[PDB]
Design a protein around this ligand. Structure first.
Ligand SMILES: Nc1ncnc2c1ncn2[C@H]1C[C@H](O)[C@@H](COP(=O)(O)OP(=O)(O)OP(=O)(O)O)O1
Ligand SMILES: [Mg+2]
Ligand code: NI
Ligand code: NI
Ligand code: NI
Length: 927
């Protein structure tokens, strides 16, 4: 520091600097030191009221200090996140319309030099902390640099090394008097936290600092809510006179109230030492997999991965929740995230999770988990309808890459509105995609790693096709292993190579130097892996799982006779499902099937029904509720019904069907679809005699010679070569011998064996060609990994864990990078409206003002019309439609495109016609 500073300069007065500033009705402002005390207070309350004890113990172990020192120091860093706001570049950012000259004269009175240079405040925070944390606070240079970059990454991305130590203007950061000012602020915040003269923490572990950045981001978000953290200054004209400690106390109580509103407090484990029959009253005699799980439960270690492989319908989820209960009770990991399969809704799972949660936690589960632990939109809607202003609302989030403070407040505020919100609460149910996003190079990934770090992860239903086609779960397992996160993976069946690479990934993250191989065990089995311990527990399949399943084919010439086949099969009655690989095929087959089954069912709704994601959300709620009401284990089963549907039935849902028709798919997916066939024994006596023998109809592809010709939709959804392997594995079967044939088929298709089996040359050509295509895809993804995936845990530099496109912002996320990695289909969110005078209107029938943000009621009614279009034909033209100016400033409606149908229910989008059918849902069609 090259500028001498006199005592008059050291008088400074800390309170003059601002961190938050008002706009309209709020003429006041928030002093920077107040904001730092607020974020530190939120960190303290997190440590004392939210975080699981195992997390605090482990982080205290990494820090090398006791839990008290770890608490005050983490609070010090998190409060130190905005230290760079004390720079000329940020203080002069103020709007001229809102008293910028007043702040200018106020700084000038202190004697601070002024400069017009501009830099993001977080990079400045890294630039100052990397030196100040060492030269004053006595931390090692590595810990200082690590805390500096991590804390400086809080608005989206950790700064690149050049951003902090090369391109950064000195005039932007300031020096001399500014350094004395920041030194004063940091010393006062530290004294308020009681840092002297406690032993200095070691922060040299890269992954830990990385997730800690996510903790800091969440803390700043909590401090950004003006309802719980009102600005201390009542007007720009005057600087408040404050005692830092009393303000810290008030900030702590406010933090407690704010986090209490989010339902993070207070999940007391309330042990306890419960058995499986107690947690789940509905089960009398536990299934064999649950028995082996109950036996394993007494021997589990704090960080370990479990892989459960049992036939579908055997009740693996209760075993997973059992191990999770053992983790929360006996190992201090009181939190869990239930990672659902991508096509699954959270609804049915959430009730099971709630029913388990009643046995371990007080009735706060009613007042907390019901609205906060749910990922899907219905909970957000009920939270909107409920009094009062239940949704968390941010303001004054100064993300430089967005155009203004409130815009950044909206983008950050999406974390409390979008499905990713389910990640935040200690118990949450949601898609596996939210957890898989943690390894992508996207905004705020460290927030995801931080959320996952505090909970055991339970991956419900893993498919072999997914683990074969992508590395996402492997990388997530590496980072999960680094964070000492317990993991349970449910699966109907996996190839041995897949289990090997998964356990290898979690072990690689764990740092487990032991290289001993996984013990062999017959199917069904439970793999297990702790530090010093590794197990392969085989167990006898339940006798109910021993069934022969008929496998009939319907060839393309017979395909139009398929409805007549449904007539001859269901003539005696009985439920039946028909899975389709794509929405348009489902709509078409349904339209064809309407002629065959006109009749109403006993429940007063038609026996024929359709289900897919492409509906306005309320209609989706109706059809989903009707389906779950018909075909669940306890539902009012119709004497006869037919349900055409996509793969939304294929995953997670607890449905039962007397008969199953399905499109060709990779075999693990077909079996997963087949798990809904005769799933519940209680339904056995009442089944029609024609359907008493389980039977699985598969839709055959057109076959020129011996060469299959897959339909374009399935070809676009699934890898073509895998479909070829599956069709070859299934084409000669007459009967499936469960449960061994499950593992047999899956280990046949995904394993090394090439079986042309002496067929035609053209088929060999199709084989080699489709395989070359698949390998070209996998290779191309492997070569683009630097631009897509974050560095693994063993990477040494805290910077460069995420490189480009840093601070865009905010880069996709779901529409873009999600698609290149095939994590999910790219899509547009849309709001179905109707045309009329005065612009777009709701169907019933009130006008919408697109120019202003919606009120919560109107936002709810608008969200009820929402739909996630994913069709390639109209996706781009829909993106070209601007998001209306009032919506992008709303966290509830950012990224949503209005979709104005006419009275005919038609709308002109691109060359294509979009139409909103009462039965078919949204329908794309050529004009
Ligand atoms: N021990 C049990 N005995 C009898 N029924 C049980 C038992 N445990 C759970 N069930 C019920 C609850 C569910 O409604 C139904 C299916 O359980 P479930 O956990 O969904 O199996 P699963 O998850 O392994 O199937 P899948 O592999 O297809 O996802 O059986
Ligand atoms: Mg399951
Ligand atoms: Ni900030
Ligand atoms: Ni801040
Ligand atoms: Ni901020």
């Amino acid at each position: 520091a090259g500028s001498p500073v006199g005592a008059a300069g050291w008088r400074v007065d800390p309170w003059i600097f601002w961190a938050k500033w008002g706009s309209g009705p709020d003429l006041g402002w928030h002093p920077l030191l107040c904001h730092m005390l607020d974020v530190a207070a939120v960190t303290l309350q997190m440590w004392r009221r939210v975080l699981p004890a195992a997390w605090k113990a482990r982080i205290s172990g990494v820090l090398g200090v006791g839990q008290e020192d770890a608490e005050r120091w983490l609070a010090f860093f998190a409060g130190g996140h905005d230290i760079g706001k004390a720079s000329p570049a940020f203080q002069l950012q103020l709007r001229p319309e809102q008293g910028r000259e007043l702040v200018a004269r106020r700084l000038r009175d202190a004697g601070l030099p002024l400069f017009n240079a501009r830099a993001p405040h977080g990079t400045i925070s890294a630039n100052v902390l990397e030196t100040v944390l060492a030269d004053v606070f006595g931390l090692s240079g590595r810990s200082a640099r690590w805390v500096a970059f991590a804390v400086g990454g809080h608005h989206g991305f950790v700064p690149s090394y050049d951003e902090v130590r090369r391109d950064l203007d000195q005039q932007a950061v300031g020096w001399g008097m500014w350094d004395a000012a920041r030194e004063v602020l940091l010393c006062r915040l530290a004294d308020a936290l009681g840092l002297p003269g406690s032993s200095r923490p070691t922060v040299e572990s890269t992954p830990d600092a990385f997730m800690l950045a996510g903790l800091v981001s969440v803390a700043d978000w909590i401090g950004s809510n003006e309802e719980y953290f009102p600005y201390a200054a009542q007007s720009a004209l005057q600087v408040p006179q404050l005692d830092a400690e009393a303000y810290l106390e008030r900030a702590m109580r406010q933090a407690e109230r704010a986090m209490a509103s989010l339902g993070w407090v207070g999940w007391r484990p309330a042990s306890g030492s419960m058995r499986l029959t107690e947690l789940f009253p509905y089960i009398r005699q536990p299934t064999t997999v649950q028995a082996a799980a109950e036996e394993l439960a007494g021997e589990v270690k704090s960080p370990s991965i479990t892989i459960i492989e049992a036939p579908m319908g055997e009740g693996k989820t209760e075993a997973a929740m059992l191990l999770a209960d053992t983790f929360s009770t006996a190992h201090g990991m009181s939190g869990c995230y239930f990672a659902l399969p991508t096509m699954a809704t959270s609804n049915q799972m959430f009730g099971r999770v709630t029913d388990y949660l009643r046995h371990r936690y007080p009735e706060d589960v009613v007042v907390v988990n019901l609205v906060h632990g749910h990922s899907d939109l219905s909970a957000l809607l009920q939270e909107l309808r409920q009094k009062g202003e239940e949704i968390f609302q941010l303001q004054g989030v100064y993300d430089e890459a967005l155009g203004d403070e409130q815009l950044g407040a909206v983008v950050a505020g999406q974390w409390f509105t979008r499905g990713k919100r389910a990640l935040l609460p200690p118990y949450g149910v949601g898609t596996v995609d939210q957890a898989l996003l943690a390894v992508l190079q996207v905004k705020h990934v460290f927030v995801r790693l931080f959320a996952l770090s505090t909970k055991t992860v339970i991956v419900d239903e893993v498919h072999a096709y997914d683990v074969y086609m992508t590395t996402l779960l492997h990388r997530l397992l590496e980072w999960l292993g680094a964070l000492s996160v317990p993991v349970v993976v449910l699966s109907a069946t996996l190839p041995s190579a897949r289990r090997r690479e998964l356990v290898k990934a979690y072990a690689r993250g764990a740092g487990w130097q032991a290289e001993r191989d996984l013990p062999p065990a017959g199917y069904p089995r439970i793999t297990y892996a702790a530090a010093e311990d590794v197990r392969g527990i085989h167990f006898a399949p339940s006798e109910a799982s021993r069934r022969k399943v008929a496998l009939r084919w319907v060839s393309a010439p017979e395909h139009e006779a398929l409805g007549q086949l449904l007539a001859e099969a269901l003539s005696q009655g009985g439920c039946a499902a028909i899975i389709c690989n794509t929405v348009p095929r489902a709509q078409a087959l349904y339209s064809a099937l309407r002629e065959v089954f006109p009749g109403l069912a006993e429940d007063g709704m038609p026996e024929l029904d359709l289900l897919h994601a492409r509906y306005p959300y309320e209609e989706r709620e109706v059809r989903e509720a009707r389906t779950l009401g018909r075909f669940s284990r306890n539902g009012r089963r119709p004497h006869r019904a037919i349900l055409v549907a996509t793969q939304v039935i294929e995953q997670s849902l607890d449905l039962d069907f007397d008969l199953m028709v399905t499109d060709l798919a990779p075999v693990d997916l077909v079996l997963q679809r087949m798990g809904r066939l005769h799933r519940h024994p209680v339904h056995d006596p009442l089944r029609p005699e024609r359907l008493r023998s389980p039977e699985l109809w598969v839709v055959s592809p057109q076959v020129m010679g011996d060469v299959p010709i897959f339909d374009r939709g399935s070809a676009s959804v699934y890898d073509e070569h895998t479909l070829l392997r599956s069709w070859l594995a299934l084409r000669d079967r007459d009967t499936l011998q469960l449960p061994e044939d499950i593992e047999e088929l899956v280990e046949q298709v995904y394993s090394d064996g090439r079986v042309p089996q002496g067929a035609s040359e053209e088929l060999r050509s199709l084989w080699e060609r489709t395989f070359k295509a698949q390998q070209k895809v996998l290779r191309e993804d492997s070569l683009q990994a630097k631009y897509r995936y974050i560095k693994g845990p063993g990477y040494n530099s805290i910077w460069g864990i995420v490189t480009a496109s840093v601070e865009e912002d905010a880069p996709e996320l779901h529409p873009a990078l999600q698609a290149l990695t095939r994590l999910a289909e790219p899509s547009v969110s849309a709001v179905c409206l109707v045309a009329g005078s005065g612009g777009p209107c709701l169907p019933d029938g009130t006008p919408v003002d697109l120019d202003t943000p919606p009120d919560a009621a109107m936002a709810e009614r608008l969200l009820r019309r929402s739909v996630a279009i994913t069709d390639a034909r109209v996706l781009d033209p829909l993106l070209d439609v601007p998001v209306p100016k009032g919506w992008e400033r709303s966290s509830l409606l950012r990224g949503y495109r209005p979709l104005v149908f006419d009275a005919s229910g038609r709308a002109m989008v691109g060359r294509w016609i979009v139409r909103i059918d009462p039965e078919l849902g949204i329908v794309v069609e050529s004009p």
